[PDB]
Design a protein around this ligand. Structure first.
Ligand SMILES: [Zn+2]
Ligand SMILES: [Zn+2]
Ligand SMILES: [Zn+2]
Ligand SMILES: [Zn+2]
Lengths: 67, 66
């Protein structure tokens, strides 16, 4: 059982207290998707995208300049 | 309220009260959580997080060194 309206990680299936009492953090992507810190890091080892919605969660900070 | 409560500290509305009435839970980049409406309201007159006061309005311009 995984009630709607509760904080949990969809990867490891751990709830809020299980996550924080083990020394992990709750994290969010910028697209609003919530994970535990360990699961999202493990995910980003094999992919640059959000596990949930697959939006790119890397951002390279450079841009064209027009002289 | 207690650890694991998703609520806005400004209006004090709990999770259910926020999302069911067309607002959203929002987080600043500094990890601080509010309802969409209270955070937006605060950002109309200040550029900083209401909780930790980190500046959270970026500057989409910068020097270029040529
Ligand atoms: Zn997890
Ligand atoms: Zn996402
Ligand atoms: Zn609020
Ligand atoms: Zn903050």
């Amino acid at each position: 059982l995984r009630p709607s309206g509760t904080v949990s990680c969809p990867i490891c299936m751990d709830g809020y207290s299980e996550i924080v009492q083990n020394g992990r953090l709750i994290v969010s992507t910028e697209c609003g998707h919530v994970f535990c810190s360990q699961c999202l890091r493990d995910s980003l080892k094999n992919a640059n995208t959000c596990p949930t919605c697959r939006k790119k969660i890397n951002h390279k900070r450079y841009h064209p300049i027009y002289i």
